Design a protein around this ligand. Structure first.
Ligand code: ZN
Lengths: 152, 16
């Protein structure tokens, strides 16, 4: 069995990565310019984009890639590091509102995870939690078009 | 340092 989403970690931070189009993407604010561990040694990022908070390495072993969305649906579904799914309604190119706000912790450690459309296709990578008094009501993300362009 | 994979998630819920 292969996973499209991998739970990654650094010496100080744990978050997620998502394989899309053969690349293992994640958020620069978590990975930095780090190499990804491999049973043959460190593997370097294929892409590093500080501006977009995006970095990607070749997809690791035990993974399978996700297909980008092509239906332009605005009904998104965020998957957390605990496998929970959170319905998010898109509000724009890179922002969505949780249908049911949740404690910030509920979303902690999940940046880098996928924002899926009704078909399970990648809409974007969860970038950051937009919260008020500790309650995450919205989500910030990196649309797949960015990943796609970055791969060029 | 380096980023290490400590786990994985299968979207379809596929069991081994
Ligand atoms: Zn779609």
């Amino acid at each position: 069995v292969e996973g499209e989403v991998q739970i990654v970690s650094t010496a100080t931070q744990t978050f997620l990565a998502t394989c899309i189009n053969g690349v293992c993407w994640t958020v620069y604010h978590g990975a930095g310019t780090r190499t990804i561990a491999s049973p043959k040694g460190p593997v370097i990022q294929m892409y590093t984009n500080v501006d977009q908070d995006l970095v990607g390495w070749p997809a690791p072993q035990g993974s399978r890639s996700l297909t980008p969305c092509t239906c332009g649906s605005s009904d998104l579904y965020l998957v957390t590091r605990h496998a929970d799914v959170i319905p998010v309604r898109r509000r724009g190119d890179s922002r969505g509102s949780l249908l049911s706000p949740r404690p910030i912790s509920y979303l902690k450690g999940s940046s880098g995870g996928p924002l899926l459309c009704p078909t399970g296709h990648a809409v974007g990578l969860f970038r950051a939690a937009v919260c008020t008094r500790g309650v995450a009501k919205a989500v910030d993300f990196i649309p797949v078009e960015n990943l796609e362009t970055t791969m060029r | 340092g380096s980023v290490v994979i400590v786990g994985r998630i299968v979207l379809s819920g596929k069991p081994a």
